[PDB]
Write a protein that binds this ligand. Structure first.
Ligand SMILES: CCCCCCCCCCCCCCCCCC(=O)OC[C@H](COP(=O)([O-])OCC(O)COP(=O)([O-])OC[C@@H](COC(=O)CCCCCCCCCCCCCCCCC)OC(=O)CCCCCCCCCCCCCCCCC)OC(=O)CCCCCCCCCCCCCCCCC
Ligand code: BCL
Ligand code: BCL
Ligand SMILES: CC[C@H]1c2cc3[nH]c4c(c3C)C(=O)[C@H](C(=O)OC)c4c3nc(cc4[nH]c(cc(n2)[C@@H]1C)c(C(C)=O)c4C)[C@@H](C)[C@@H]3CCC(=O)OC/C=C(\C)CCC[C@H](C)CCC[C@H](C)CCCC(C)C
Ligand SMILES: COC1=C(OC)C(=O)C(C/C=C(\C)CC/C=C(\C)CC/C=C(\C)CC/C=C(\C)CC/C=C(\C)CC/C=C(\C)CC/C=C(\C)CC/C=C(\C)CC/C=C(\C)CCC=C(C)C)=C(C)C1=O
Ligand SMILES: CCCCCCCCCCCCCCCCCC(=O)OC[C@H](COP(=O)([O-])OCC[N+](C)(C)C)OC(=O)CCCCCCCCCCCCCCCCC
Ligand SMILES: COC(C)(C)C/C=C/C(C)=C/C=C/C(C)=C/C=C/C(C)=C/C=C/C=C(C)/C=C/C=C(\C)CC/C=C(\C)CCC=C(C)C
Ligand SMILES: COC(C)(C)C/C=C/C(C)=C/C=C/C(C)=C/C=C/C(C)=C/C=C/C=C(C)/C=C/C=C(\C)CC/C=C(\C)CCC=C(C)C
Ligand SMILES: COC(C)(C)C/C=C/C(C)=C/C=C/C(C)=C/C=C/C(C)=C/C=C/C=C(C)/C=C/C=C(\C)CC/C=C(\C)CCC=C(C)C
Ligand SMILES: COC(C)(C)C/C=C/C(C)=C/C=C/C(C)=C/C=C/C(C)=C/C=C\C=C(C)\C=C\C=C(/C)CC/C=C(\C)CCC=C(C)C
Ligand SMILES: COC(C)(C)C/C=C/C(C)=C/C=C/C(C)=C/C=C/C(C)=C\C=C\C=C(C)\C=C\C=C(/C)CC/C=C(\C)CCC=C(C)C
Ligand SMILES: [Fe+2]
Lengths: 60, 254, 304, 43, 53, 281, 60, 44, 44, 53, 43, 44
């Protein structure tokens, strides 16, 4: 009974928005996981001795 | 009388301002008591009489002696409130608590509730000083002619659902005031029905009534007389029509 | 969606000459007129007036007043019509010099002022009596006269009483369009800042309240005109859904309400209290208080 | 006699409960005014 | 002192309750603001001063 | 809490926003969405006024004053102790007023009556805004608005008016005055007329609209009608406030000098300037 | 046929999001109208002579 | 703590969801405008 | 017996239990936050 | 104390809850502003100074 | 009791989804608050 | 220009809407990260 939208257009509009936002939520999840990955990497690197950030370059 | 303090800093100015505060207090009393002649005693939703009857007491009855031998009206009084009291009300409590609405049980435009409510004014018409009826159709009003404006008579009557229902026939006028109160309709259904001019907008090609839709124009209360109209019928009609701004809105277009 | 501001359809008929309730019909006129420019916003009948004794007194005296001021305007203008229509607003029948005190001014400007004021006196009081009588002849109440008396109270306080108490007709108002404005300003500036005249504040409160109230009342009565709320006398005696709806609007809005007669009682007071408080606040200016900002400081609504 | 429709018993019960609430209010208030008088006397 | 409950045979508890609720809240607010305007009891300025901030 | 006729109107509906949520009454009062909003805003503004005067240490209701930021603050938000309070109180006041209007609307459409009243109120909100929002923005700074003190907004009036000499010479001000006076006049006349009909001499019957029309035709030769007088007083008030808003929005934005120098365009018209006569010769 | 979500929970979720976002869109419309109002005001003020921003203060 | 679902038996959920949308968006703008005012916390 | 609302002692006890649950949760949060604000910046 | 539940035999949950929400939010905003009014207890400016920003 | 027309089952469902969204909101908000403490701390 | 509605006869709209959500969110982060990189256009 509740949740009943009489109008055809409003029903279509709330559906399409749901679909679009679902996709954007997937993308955000992916971006966030990548971000956590790289950032945790950097941080764990901060736990390392100072000679890690001193190393000579290979020029390449 | 400059620099003359009776005591402390109190001079004629202070005395006057304080006297004014006092007079004003008495005056608010007076006015908010004279605004009690109609509506009190306070009721509950049950129709009972409640404990909180206000902090201002209801005043002592006065008397209105009416013209044309219509009698004496006493306000505040029990006769006054009981005459204008509606009964057989199609309403249902929305909750046992107070301060919540009461839904219309059936068709409200008919059941006379809400914006469509009416009040039992007396089924005697409104009169001028001479005792002649106030509202006459323009044809009985001797000498009455359109002095300006768009003569609506004969124009179709568009309604809220944009559909058409009939044609205007006659104009009901306030002769002592020289103005048009109601307009009559020759409906498709073969019936005559009034509609207040304040609810009808005269266009060049038509008369628009955005209040109500077409299904309603037929169930409008009628008049027991085609030359006169009483206060009661006026309230019924006007309430019915005005209720369409709420109860026929699902039908209104444009 | 018809708001009832401008009348759509006009109608008319033989003029409504009057109601014979003890009125002297011979002192009444018999010619009327229709002027549709008004019919759009009101009745179009410029109906018969009553030509009575008090009315004749008033007309004669006030026309002498008007034309007296115009005479001095001319003399002050060099009789040059272009100067008249140039300095029309800057001209003035200024008030007597203080040297004369309350005596009959020994100058032309001064005595012309004095006489014009005598004429105004006669006119205003005649008109007040005319209100009383027109309401006594139709058998109505004298509320209109007791309201006008309030206006007269202020007007007197400004022209006649306050000066007598101060001993100078110099204190009274000049008869000009810009000079009486200058008079108001100089009156405030001489006596402190008039704002701090509590009775000035009250008269203001009631002016603003009168506007508040008339907008309220008018908008209401046009809102409930679709139920004939415009016909009020019949909703005091035979109450209908118009009055009920208006009352309940104001109840549900601000918790209190009025009746189709008590709102009229509220109006009669917000109106007259504009000039009752003003008269007092003007009397007390200079007779009881030479400065109002200091009175405030002393009385606690202004800081040290 | 009852201007509100109560009986003596409904009233007595309501009053016991109102009294409970009032005494709780007063109790907390006393605790607090005490703590204050200990923290910054005003007398 | 033994028949105070009879007050509810006089006043309606809804109104009384709302009234005293408003009353107490405003009373408390006013007393708090009073202290807050007296800088010897302004707990905020005090705690600033006592803790050196 | 109800009147003897308040019931058959206590029906659901007539709500711009919300629905069942908030369609109820608290005592006499109707509280919808906008009732909740106006209560919140009003209460907050009130408490902030009190805290502002508490910080100041003032507790006299007549000497309490919350003032706007300096003019140098310009149109930025300031510290609460130097204008932020005035600004928040302005926000809350405006929300409260607009919500009062919208509440009136909800009620007008539940009781099935026209929307003339919220319209009338809108002009007042417009003028308040002209004072505290628009005129500043156009003048460049919040500090040109008025303070929230009973006897200090009067000082703002005085100083703002003496900036341009005698404000009396502003013509839109003249019209505001005139319409205000005529409003009070018509109000008194209406009330007196009606009461004089309903409450006539002792021993006489009630009167009718015909007697009112006749009395005023007798007096001044014209009667406007029972509807026309309401129309009239309404329009008088509105045009007054209209002229009053027009008078202020043009004071320090289009005009900058004494207002007297405006009327000197009529003197200085070439065909009566040099004339030596009168006041200006 | 399209637009048909078999699941009860997903149907409820897309509906409630639509309702919430509708409300937020109303609020944004209001904020934007207020913003346009004030900003157009300021701008039209920039069209005015320089004496507008010179005016003395009333100290209040 | 587990019987809070009973609020939807009190208030219509449609209107409550719209109202939350409004409330939260308005709170967001309120704080953003609060922060924007301060130079230390403004980012533009 | 007496009910200006319709609820009998049963529904009343239920509703009250849930309301007090919510109240104690609110109060727990506020107590935690007050202790924190005391640590960071005492006010007595 | 045992019988406080009868409050809902007096008041309705709907109006009470509207009241509660309004009042609590109002109070919260009020106290937050009270604090932001003091150059102290204003977390924003405090942090601004602490971190030398 | 049911003032709005809903039963315990419907209400349980609706609450489940509401609190789903709520915990999502709080998650996103605590993330953003953390990042801001990173950018411009306030304690 | 008016017969573009025929694209929904080619591609299922459900998947297209999800895909647009993805594409647009990713484009947004792309540009924000592009702008964040530049000190002139970074706002933090
Ligand atoms: C330490 C001190 C502490 C504090 C002390 C405080 C004490 C408070 C005590 C209580 C006072 C309450 C007064 C208000 C009640 C009125 C209610 C009402 O609306 O109608 C009542 C009701 C109206 O009747 P109705 O419903 O219209 O119908 C009646 C008839 O059926 C049909 O009607 P009708 O046509 O036959 O007659 C209509 C008339 C019914 O009344 C009458 O007929 C008589 C009305 C009075 C007229 C004047 C009396 C005659 C002598 C006047 C002298 C004037 C000298 C100038 C030259 C002469 C001019 C003629 O209707 C009215 O509305 C009457 C009220 C009029 C009030 C006055 C308005 C004009 C005054 C303007 C200012 C001028 C004077 C200067 C004031 C300042 C001085 C410093 O009448 C009454 O209840 C009795 C009449 C009351 C007599 C007057 C007494 C009050 C006057 C107060 C004026 C304000 C003074 C300033 C305050 C202090 C400032 C410092
Ligand atoms: C109109 C253009 C000027 C102005 C010029 C003046 C002048 C001139 C005077 C005042 C006066 C008043 N003005 Mg004002 N006033 C202005 C703007 C306002 C605003 C506003 C929200 O903008 C308010 C609420 C007030 C408030 C007031 C009252 C303190 C007082 C009587 C008004 C009255 O009777 O109203 C009419 C309506 C009613 C009768 C209803 C009653 C409303 C109540 C009385 C208002 C009180 C507000 C309350 C104390 C504060 C809220 C908490 N003014 C602007 C800035 N005002 C008069 C006074 O005595 O001041 C000391 C006075 O002399
Ligand atoms: C700058 C100067 C001072 C100031 C100086 C004064 C002075 C001085 C006075 C007031 C007075 C008033 N001022 Mg001012 N006033 C100031 C500031 C304000 C402000 C403001 C927002 O700042 C406002 C709103 C007001 C408000 C008011 C009114 C409330 C009040 C007069 C009401 C009235 O009806 O008068 C007009 C009413 C009349 C004169 C009634 C006259 C009626 C008679 C019968 C007319 C006869 C008609 C005649 C024959 C013409 C015939 C016409 C044809 C037939 C058509 N003033 C400033 C601060 N003001 C008055 C008052 O009460 O003082 C306290 C007054 O005298
Ligand atoms: C209660 C206070 C208000 C008030 C009321 C008031 N005035 C009144 C009345 C009332 C109730 C009348 O009954 C009477 C009238 O007829 O009004 C239409 C009147 C009146 N007040 C008038 C004007 C007026 N009222 C004013 C204001 C006010 N009077 C107050 C605001 C003002 C101003 C500026 O404040 C003015 C100018 C007149 C229209 C009229 C007084 C009639 C009079 O005395 O005329 C005398 C002069 C002549 C007959 C000849 C004139 C000659 C020239 C050709 C012009
Ligand atoms: C045709 O006849 C008519 C009537 O009669 C039918 C009338 O009555 C009226 C109405 C006119 C009057 C009553 C005359 C008196 C009017 C005045 C003097 C005007 C000035 C008024 C006042 C000074 C009073 C102002 C009061 C206000 C603003 C109310 C204050 C109340 C609150 C802020 C509380 C609001 C509460 C809410 C919204 C609910 C709370 C919510 C919770 C959740 C709790 C008119 C015009 C009329 O024309
Ligand atoms: C300061 C001036 C008054 C401010 C308003 C205070 C009253 C209020 O807001 O609500 C009262 C409440 C609000 O509604 P209420 O529902 O609480 O009032 C119920 C009133 N009884 C019990 C009589 C039914 O109304 C009243 O108390 C009724 C009478 C009030 C009359 C107030 C008129 C003041 C006019 C001032 C003119 C002079 C100004 C100079
Ligand atoms: C400048 O002026 C200053 C102030 C400096 C000096 C002047 C001061 C003045 C003028 C002071 C005047 C003081 C006066 C006149 C004080 C009067 C006080 C009185 C009369 C107080 C009365 C108090 C009464 C109380 C608290 C009653 C309480 C009653 C109850 C709780 C019992 C409840 C009643 C019930 C239940 C009724 C039973 C009902 C039924 C149906 C059985
Ligand atoms: C100016 O002065 C200052 C501000 C400085 C100082 C003064 C400050 C003051 C005076 C502050 C006062 C604060 C007060 C009085 C605070 C009171 C707080 C209370 C009483 C809080 C109560 C909170 C209750 C909550 C949050 C309850 C929530 C409940 C729910 C979310 C679930 C309930 C579920 C229900 C009812 C479902 C069952 C329903 C049915 C119909 C079966
Ligand atoms: C210048 O002025 C200053 C402020 C400086 C000094 C003066 C201050 C003044 C004048 C202060 C005055 C303070 C007063 C008069 C305080 C009075 C406080 C009172 C009387 C408080 C009462 C509180 C009562 C409470 C909280 C009761 C709560 C009750 C309940 C929660 C239970 C409600 C009832 C139920 C559930 C029973 C229902 C049963 C049935 C059968 C329906
Ligand atoms: C076109 O040119 C011609 C000559 C044909 C006609 C033109 C006429 C013109 C231009 C007329 C202009 C008239 C004007 C501008 C009149 C303006 C009057 C104004 C603005 C008056 C304002 C206030 C006046 C007041 C308050 C006067 C009050 C006076 C009294 C209360 C008189 C009281 C009695 C006094 C002073 C003493 C006499 C008393 C006794 C008992 C004899
Ligand atoms: C002066 O005061 C200032 C402003 C400076 C400081 C004070 C600020 C205050 C007092 C702020 C108060 C904030 C409050 C009380 C915020 C409360 C927020 C709440 C309770 C938010 C609840 C949100 C719930 C949401 C968003 C739930 C949504 C659920 C759905 C849309 C269902 C669909 C589910 C999905 C999409 C999940 C799928 C995975
Ligand atoms: Fe009227």
């Amino acid at each position: 009974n509740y949740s009943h939208e009489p109008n055809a257009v409003i029903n279509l509009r709330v559906w399409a928005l749901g679909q679009m936002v679902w996709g954007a939520f997937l993308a955000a999840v992916g971006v966030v996981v990548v971000i956590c990955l790289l950032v945790g990497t950097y941080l764990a690197g901060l736990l390392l001795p100072e000679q890690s950030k001193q190393a000579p370059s290979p020029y390449g | 009388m400059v620099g003359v303090n009776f005591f402390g800093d109190f001079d004629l100015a202070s005395l006057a301002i304080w006297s004014f505060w006092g007079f004003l207090a008495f005056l608010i009393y007076y006015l908010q008591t004279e605004n009690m002649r109609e509506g009190y005693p306070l009721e509950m939703e049950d129709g009972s009489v409640a404990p909180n009857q206000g902090l201002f007491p209801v005043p002592k009855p006065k008397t209105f002696k009416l013209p044309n031998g219509r009698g004496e009206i006493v306000m505040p009084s029990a006769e006054n409130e009981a005459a204008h009291r509606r009964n057989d009300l199609a309403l249902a409590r929305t909750s046992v608590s107070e301060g919540f609405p009461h839904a219309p049980t059936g068709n409200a435009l008919v059941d006379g509730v809400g914006p469509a409510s009416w009040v039992p004014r007396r089924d005697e018409p409104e009169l001028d000083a001479h005792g002649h009826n106030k509202i006459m159709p323009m044809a009985l009003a001797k000498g009455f002619n359109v002095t300006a404006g768009r003569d609506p008579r004969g124009l179709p009557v568009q309604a809220a659902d944009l559909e058409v229902v009939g044609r205007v026939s006659e104009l009901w006028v306030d002769v002592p005031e020289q103005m048009v109160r109601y307009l009559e309709i020759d409906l498709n259904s073969g019936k005559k029905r009034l509609v207040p001019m304040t609810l009808a907008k005269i266009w060049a090609d038509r008369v628009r009534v955005n209040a109500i839709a077409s299904d309603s124009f037929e169930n409008i209360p009628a008049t027991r007389s085609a030359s006169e109209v009483t206060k009661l019928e006026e309230d019924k009609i006007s309430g019915y029509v005005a209720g369409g701004w709420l109860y026929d809105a699902d039908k209104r277009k444009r | 969606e018809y708001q009832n501001i401008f009348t759509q359809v006009q109608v008319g008929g033989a003029p409504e000459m009057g109601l014979v309730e003890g009125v002297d019909l011979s002192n009444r006129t018999k010619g009327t007129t229709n002027w549709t420019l008004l019919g759009w916003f009101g009745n179009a009948q410029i109906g018969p007036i009553y030509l009575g004794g008090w009315g004749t007194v008033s007309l004669i005296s006030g026309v002498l007043w008007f034309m007296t001021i115009g005479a001095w305007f001319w003399y002050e203008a060099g009789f040059n019509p272009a100067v008249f229509m140039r300095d029309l607003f800057y001209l003035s029948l200024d008030a007597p010099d203080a040297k004369y005190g309350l005596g009959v001014p020994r100058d032309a400007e001064g005595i012309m002022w004095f006489i014009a004021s005598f004429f105004m006196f006669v006119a205003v009081w005649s008109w007040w009596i005319r209100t009383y009588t027109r309401a006594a002849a139709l058998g109505m109440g004298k509320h209109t006269a007791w309201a006008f008396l309030s206006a007269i109270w202020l007007w007197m306080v400004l022209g006649f009483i306050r000066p007598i108490l101060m001993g100078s007709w110099s204190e009274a108002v000049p008869y000009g369009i810009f000079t009486h404005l200058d008079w108001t300003n100089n009156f405030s500036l001489t006596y402190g800042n008039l704002f701090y005249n509590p009775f000035h504040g009250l008269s203001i409160a009631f002016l603003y309240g009168s506007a508040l109230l008339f907008a309220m009342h008018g908008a209401t009565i046009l809102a409930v005109s679709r139920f004939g709320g415009d016909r009020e006398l019949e909703q005091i005696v035979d109450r209908g859904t118009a009055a009920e709806r208006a009352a309940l609007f104001w109840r549900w809005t601000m918790g209190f309400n009025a009746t189709m007669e008590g709102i009229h009682r509220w109006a009669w007071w917000f109106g007259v209290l504009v000039t009752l408080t003003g008269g007092i606040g003007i009397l007390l200016s200079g007779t009881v208080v030479d400065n109002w900002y200091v009175w405030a400081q002393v009385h606690g609504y202004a800081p040290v | 006699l009852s201007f509100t429709g109560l009986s003596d018993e409904q009233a007595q019960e309501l009053h016991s409960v109102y009294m409970s609430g009032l005494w709780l209010f007063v109790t907390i208030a006393v605790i607090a005014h005490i703590a204050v008088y200990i923290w910054r006397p005003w007398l | 002192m033994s028949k105070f409950y009879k007050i509810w045979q006089v006043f309606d508890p809804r109104r009384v309750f709302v009234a005293q609720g408003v009353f107490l809240f405003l009373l408390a607010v006013m007393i708090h603001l009073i202290l807050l305007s007296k800088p010897d009891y302004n707990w905020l300025d005090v705690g600033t001063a006592k803790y050196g901030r | 809490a109800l009147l003897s006729f308040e019931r058959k109107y206590r029906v659901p509906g007539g709500t711009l926003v919300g629905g069942n949520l908030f369609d109820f009454w608290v005592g006499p009062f109707y509280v919808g969405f906008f009732g909740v909003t106006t209560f919140f805003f009003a209460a907050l503004g009130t408490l902030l006024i009190l805290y502002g005067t508490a910080m100041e240490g003032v507790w006299n209701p007549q000497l309490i004053s919350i003032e706007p930021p300096s003019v140098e603050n310009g149109l930025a938000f300031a510290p609460l102790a130097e204008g932020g309070l005035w600004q928040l109180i302005t926000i809350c006041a405006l929300g409260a007023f607009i919500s009062w209007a919208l509440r009136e609307v909800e009620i007008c459409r539940k009781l099935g009556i026209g929307l003339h009243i919220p319209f009338a109120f809108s002009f007042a909100i417009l003028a308040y805004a002209v004072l505290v929002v628009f005129r500043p923005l156009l003048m460049g700074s919040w500090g040109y608005a008025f303070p929230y003190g009973i006897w200090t907004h009067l000082d703002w009036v005085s100083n703002t008016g003496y900036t341009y000499g005698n404000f009396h010479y502003n013509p839109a001000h003249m019209l505001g005055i005139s319409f205000f006076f005529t409003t009070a006049l018509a109000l008194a006349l209406h009330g007196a007329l009606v009461l004089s009909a309903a409450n006539p001499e002792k021993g006489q019957e009630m009167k009718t609209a015909d007697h009112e029309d006749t009395f005023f035709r007798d007096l001044v030769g014209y009667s406007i009608g029972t509807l026309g007088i309401h129309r009239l007083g309404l329009l008088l008030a509105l045009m007054a406030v209209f002229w009053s808003a027009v008078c202020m929005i043009i004071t320090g934005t289009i005009w900058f000098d004494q207002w007297s120098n405006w009327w000197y365009w009529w003197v200085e018209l070439p065909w009566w300037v040099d004339i030596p006569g009168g006041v200006n010769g």
